[PDB]
């Protein structure tokens, strides 16, 4: 995976998101904080139970951001496991 299509595939997602909300920079920060939050609720040595986090939450937070604008949501969903149908 030196530079698989998936790599540029991901970059395109983040890029488009940036160029999309050029007027609303605050949006960019949030999205990144979402994926970032995931990482936070992972470390801390042993994964002791305490309402952690995973892909499910990230999907919600990002969805909350891109409300109505499910266009970008579709891209994010591609990475996440497809639900029913």
């Amino acid at each position: 995976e030196s530079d698989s299509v998936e790599f540029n595939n991901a970059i395109s997602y983040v890029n488009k998101i940036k160029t999309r909300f050029l007027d609303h920079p605050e949006i960019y920060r949030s999205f990144l904080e979402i994926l970032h939050t995931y990482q936070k609720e992972q470390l801390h040595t042993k994964g002791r139970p305490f309402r952690g986090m995973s892909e499910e939450e990230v999907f919600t937070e990002v969805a909350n951001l891109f409300r109505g604008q499910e266009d970008l949501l579709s891209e994010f969903g591609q990475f996440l496991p497809e639900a029913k149908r």
């Binding site: 890029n15 994926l35 970032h36 990230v58 990475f79």
Partner: peptide
């Protein structure tokens, strides 16, 4: 999959 997106942000930034 998240690794690519999360990492992607750093690339552009």
């Amino acid at each position: 999959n998240i690794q690519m997106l999360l990492e992607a942000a750093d690339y552009l930034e």
